[PDB]
Paper text:
Leukotriene (LT) C4 synthase (LTC4S) catalyzes the conjugation of the fatty acid LTA4 with the tripeptide GSH to produce LTC4, the parent compound of the cysteinyl leukotrienes, important mediators of asthma. LTC4S is a trimeric integral membrane protein and a member of the MAPEG (membrane-associated proteins in eicosanoid and glutathione metabolism) family, which also includes three microsomal GSH S-transferases, 5-lipoxygenase activating protein, and microsomal prostaglandin E synthase 1 (9, 10). The crystal structure of human LTC4S has been solved and identified a unique horseshoe-shaped conformation of GSH bound at the active site by residues from two neighboring monomers. It was postulated that the lipid substrate LTA4 binds in a hydrophobic crevice between two monomers and that Trp-116 could act as a “molecular ruler” for binding of LTA4 with its ω-end buried under the aromatic side chain.
We exchanged Trp-116 in LTC4S for an Ala or Phe residue and analyzed the effects on catalysis and kinetic parameters. Considering the inherent variability that comes with enzyme assays with highly unstable lipid substrates, no major kinetic alterations were observed, thus demonstrating that Trp-116 is not essential for catalysis. To further probe the role of Trp-116 for the positioning of LTA4 at the active site, we solved the structures of W116A and W116F LTC4S in complex with analog I, at 2.7 and 2.4 Å resolution, respectively. Comparing the omit map densities between the WT structure and the W116A mutant, it is clear that the acyl chain of analog I is less ordered (data not shown), which coincides well with previous proposals that the function of Trp-116 is to anchor the tail of LTA4. Hence, Trp-116 appears to aid in the positioning of the ω-end of LTA4 but this substrate-enzyme interaction seems to have very little, if any, impact on substrate turnover. The sulfur in analog I in the W116A and W116F mutants shows a larger shift of ∼7.1 Å. In the W116A and W116F mutants, the three terminal carbons shift by ∼3.5 Å upwards toward the position of the Trp-116. This is most likely due to the larger space available in the absence of the tryptophan residue. The increased Km values of W116A/W116F for GSH are probably indirect effects of changes in LTA4 binding.
Author numbering:
A (entry chain A), B (entry chain A), C (entry chain A): -4 to 149
Write the structure that this text describes.
Amino acid sequence: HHHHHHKDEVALLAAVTLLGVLLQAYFSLQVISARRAFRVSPPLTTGPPEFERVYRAQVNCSEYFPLFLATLWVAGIFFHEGAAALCGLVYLFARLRYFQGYARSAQLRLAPLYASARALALLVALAALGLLAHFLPAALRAALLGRLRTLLPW
Amino acid sequence: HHHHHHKDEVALLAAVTLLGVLLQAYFSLQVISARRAFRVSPPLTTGPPEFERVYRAQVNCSEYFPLFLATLWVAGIFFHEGAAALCGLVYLFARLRYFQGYARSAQLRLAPLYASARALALLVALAALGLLAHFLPAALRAALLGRLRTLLPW
Amino acid sequence: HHHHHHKDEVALLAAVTLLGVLLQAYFSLQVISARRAFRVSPPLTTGPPEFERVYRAQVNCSEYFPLFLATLWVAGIFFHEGAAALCGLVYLFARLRYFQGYARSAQLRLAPLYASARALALLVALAALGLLAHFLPAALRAALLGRLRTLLPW
Ligand SMILES: CCCCCCSC[C@H](NC(=O)CC[C@H]([NH3+])C(=O)O)C(=O)NCC(=O)O
Ligand SMILES: CCCCCCSC[C@H](NC(=O)CC[C@H]([NH3+])C(=O)O)C(=O)NCC(=O)O
Ligand SMILES: CCCCCCSC[C@H](NC(=O)CC[C@H]([NH3+])C(=O)O)C(=O)NCC(=O)O
Ligand SMILES: CCCCCC/C=C/CCCCCCCC(=O)O
Ligand SMILES: CCCCCC/C=C/CCCCCCCC(=O)O
Ligand SMILES: CCCCCC/C=C/CCCCCCCC(=O)O
Ligand code: NI
Ligand code: NI
Ligand code: NI
Ligand code: NI
Ligand code: NI
Ligand code: NI
Ligand code: NI
């Protein structure tokens, strides 16, 4: 304390973040369940195709989850919190579908994969635009000022 | 600047975070050390059971580390910083024990694994409660207001 | 809102963060491209040495990316934003070189690997120093105060 909080500026990003964590946890329990169904004991991550697909779905989601988080927060802070949260929700939903698809067949992972990549790319673009909005004016001003300069003439 | 900082509201979360990083680094050096002991050269992540166990312990910890971070921060901001840090400390300790256990035997990874999952689940519950506390009143109010509405009667 | 923002205190950390995301994405597209070149279809992460090297380069980078993020932010907030961003830039550049090297040969991954580890270690040290600066005075004061205590004597 501090007589103000910035919780209000980030609660939706936080809610989507927690939702993402819960979804990852879900994936983990699904991998353990495939480990019982197809009798694959730790360590060792090879087995029947269906296990390898479930396993691999969880691994890919894990690898993308920090990318999602980073961009979600940057976009939400630099561009717009609500838009970022929406894209995040779409992303996470796409990822749930990716995992389910993959579990059934490699080919069925593909449509939700593409959906998830577009949402992520949108998040990136918002992050980039937000950062650009932050930095570009001061930079342009500094460049104009140096040019100015001229002076003691004109 | 800014004539105030919010460092004070997050320093314990930050300290636990750094501690978590250091522990992950430690795991990494342990995997490289198992790579020398059992002669496994990159790439390739298969070898004797003990190497595969050490390797796999490091991989699982890596996969859970972002989940831990996300929830630690949400819990610490939305619920209570100290509680979140404590759960985080317990989690990380549980994880150190998980890795050591696993290195010795798959079965010995199990007790600290369960300890780590409970701490994580507690962190999730705090995150959830904190978010609920943030959103639920305004929502309930908005719902009551819409009902009210009635009016120009009663 | 809130009539101030802390975007200004973190924009460089955010820019480096986004840059890191873009680099990871790049690595991902490189793995998919190696999957087409050497005909390796999902799931299954074994194949010719060059594929396994590209794959493995992407995996290692993925595993270190959250460590990098955590420390980058802690260092940037607790120590100095600009220094942290610089180290981050060096780190990410080192990582680009690590991935390219690895893709060509296991041995060529080694020099940029070491460069990346030093930048990361520097980030850790800054995080640690920043945290120490935050906590150590109050602690020392509290300890001196308890000693003081004496009193009603001296
Ligand atoms: C908005 C920009 C986002 C970047 C997308 C880049 S390509 C997609 C991405 N490719 C990878 O992750 C490559 C590595 C992955 N670990 C693998 O073994 O295939 C993927 O979905 N891999 C898993 C899959 O193919 O299902
Ligand atoms: C509080 C909620 C947290 C969610 C816990 C879900 S189950 C535990 C978790 N399961 C997984 O990670 C599955 C995937 C893992 N990569 C594997 O190959 O087994 C685990 O500890 N795997 C490694 C292990 O079994 O040691
Ligand atoms: C500043 C402190 C940072 C900590 C560095 C610790 S050692 C380096 C690190 N070792 C590991 O990641 C071990 C696990 C890795 N997954 C593997 O299979 O080799 C690495 O670069 N592995 C990949 C590689 O050797 O290229
Ligand atoms: C590791 C991933 C990145 C996490 C970074 C999140 C940091 C947030 C700090 C700034 C919060 C201040 C309020 C936001 C300002 C605004 O909404 O315009
Ligand atoms: C990617 C993981 C999530 C990281 C998010 C952390 C963002 C912090 C921004 C808000 C900080 C403001 C002070 C906290 C307010 C409080 O303690 O009540
Ligand atoms: C999960 C990785 C860690 C993310 C944490 C980032 C949280 C930032 C909250 C505090 C921001 C307030 C401004 C910084 C104060 C300063 O620069 O001295
Ligand atoms: Ni104040
Ligand atoms: Ni006060
Ligand atoms: Ni403030
Ligand atoms: Ni101010
Ligand atoms: Ni001033
Ligand atoms: Ni204000
Ligand atoms: Ni106002």
